[PDB]
């Protein structure tokens, strides 16, 4: 459908529960069950547009990953139906 | 690395064990453990170039999927390191 806003909140020693891949756009390859990501509504196929309010279209994979690793246990994302 | 050729062989009522996504290229979003795909050497991040000898760059997702569903229990693929 249209856009999609969501907030993930995790445990202090656990993961958000999703994998991403980048081609050239960045999208969700996998979402673990019962993870903050699934419970939040993340779905394989979604594409990452913003992270904590920042757009990522111009950033490289390792960077995006770095931002997410440094976001503490809360995470605000914005995705768009990919495929 | 360079190319990568592989052959998957499955059970008669089981799956090959992998998911694919297409953007616009088609690549492996997930590979289940102990599946013909993993044991064959398929890796998340790989991109599908050919299926049973046919190139897919010009084919749509549902088609690619259809070809694989009709390939019986054996499957010959060719992938290239994606990301």
């Amino acid at each position: 459908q249209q856009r999609k806003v969501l907030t993930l909140e995790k445990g202090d020693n656990q993961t958000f529960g999703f994998e991403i891949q980048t081609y050239g756009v960045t999208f969700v390859a996998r979402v673990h069950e019962s993870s903050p990501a699934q419970l939040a509504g993340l779905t394989p196929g979604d594409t990452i547009a913003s992270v904590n309010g920042l757009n990522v279209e111009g950033i490289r994979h390792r960077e995006i990953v770095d931002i997410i690793k440094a976001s503490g246990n809360v995470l605000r994302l914005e995705t768009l139906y990919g495929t | 690395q360079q190319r990568k050729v592989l052959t998957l062989e499955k059970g008669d009522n089981q799956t090959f064990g992998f998911e694919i996504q297409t953007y616009g290229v088609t690549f492996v979003a997930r590979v289940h453990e102990s599946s013909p795909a993993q044991l064959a050497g398929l890796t998340p991040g790989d991109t599908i170039a050919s299926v049973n000898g046919l190139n897919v760059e010009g084919i749509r997702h549902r088609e690619i999927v259809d070809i694989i569903k009709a390939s019986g229990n054996v499957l010959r693929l060719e992938t290239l390191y994606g990301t």
Partner: peptide
């Protein structure tokens, strides 16, 4: 490459 998060 796929990254876990």
């Amino acid at each position: 490459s796929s990254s876990s998060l």
